[PDB]
Each structure stands twice: as structure tokens, then as C-alpha cells.
Amino acid sequence: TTVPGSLVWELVKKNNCFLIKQFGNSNAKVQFSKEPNNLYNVHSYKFSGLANSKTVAVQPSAGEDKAVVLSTTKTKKQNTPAKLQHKTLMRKEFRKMAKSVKNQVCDNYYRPDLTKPALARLSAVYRSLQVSKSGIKKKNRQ
């Protein structure tokens, strides 16, 4: 982002290739953004994976089990896309993995914005991997 985060937001807020909007421009409008480096996949300036210098992505990994990728952008290497993302493939237990994500997101003051959301996506991703391994045992409707 040569131009600042706010200007990239103001430039991509209305149509961006990662945005899925349905139900029209009325009060019914549903907006999600589907870029990898967005946590809640909410289209807003807090979360946006394009309008920001500092973003935290947490993805279930390519073909391999129980391995979660945590990546954060590097603030200084913005104009070098191949070398913009710091990824780490952690297969440790949940508690250790969450300690690491706090280390990388909140405790270094990288971006405390996403201290909670990144751990929420970590929870959801980790259990998605669990169930992709075991299968449905709970229905979780109660």
C-alpha cells in the first residue's frame, strides 16, 4: 500500500473483486468480503484485507491435518507482494497455538484490533480441522 490505508479503503469500499453482495442495495443488503487475509470476512475498514497495512490471516492449511497457518503482513515490504506475508504453519495443541497468536497479534502491539477476532477464527478453524478428521459426533443445536 504505497497510498495509505484510508485511501485504499476509500478507493475499494464500493466494488472490490473479493466482495460478495446480495439482496440488492436495499435494507436487505448482505455484504461479505472473501479475501484470505480478512478474519470475520466482514467488509469494513477494521477487518479489510486490502485497505490495511497490518492484517492477520488464519487459514486451515493445504493438504495436511491439524495444521493452521497464521500469517501477518509486514508493514515495510508492501510493494513486494511475494514477500509481504509472514506465514507460520503451527500444528501444536490449541492452547499453545492461541498463545502464539496472542504473541503475534496483541502482545507485540502489531495489531491489538484483532486480538479477539483472530482467536475466534482460530477456534473455528481448529474445530473445522478436528471435525474434518473425526466426523460429526455432536450436532451442537442445543
Partner 1 sequence: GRMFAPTRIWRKWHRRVNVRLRRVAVASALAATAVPAIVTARGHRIESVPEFPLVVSDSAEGIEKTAQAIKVLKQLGAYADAEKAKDSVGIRPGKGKMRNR
Partner 2 sequence: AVPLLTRKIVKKRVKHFKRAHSDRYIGLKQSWRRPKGIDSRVRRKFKGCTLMPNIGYGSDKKTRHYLPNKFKKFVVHNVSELELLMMHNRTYCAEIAHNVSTKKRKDIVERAAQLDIVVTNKLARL
Partner 3 sequence: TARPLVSVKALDGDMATDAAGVPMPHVMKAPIRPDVITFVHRLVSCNS
Partner RNA sequence: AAAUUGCCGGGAGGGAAGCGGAUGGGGGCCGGCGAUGCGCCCCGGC
Partner RNA sequence: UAGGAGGGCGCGGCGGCCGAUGCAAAACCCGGGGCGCGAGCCCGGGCGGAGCGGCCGUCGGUGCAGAUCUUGGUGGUAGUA
CA–CA separation, 1 and 43 (whole Å): 18
Of positions 4, 7, 10, 20, contacts partner 2 by CB under 8 A: 20
Of positions 3, 17, 30, 82, contacts partner 2 by CB under 8 A: 30
Q: Grid coordinates representing 94?
A: 490449541
Residue window 110-139: x/- pattern of binding to partner 2, with contact defined by CB under 8 A: -------x--xx--xx-xx--xx---x--x
Closer by beta carbon to RNA, 106 or else 125: 125
Phi, psi for residue 140 in degrees, rounded to 5: 55, 45
Question: Can residue 94 be called a binding residue for partner 2 (CB under 8 A)?
Answer: no
CA–CA separation, 72 and 31 (whole Å): 24
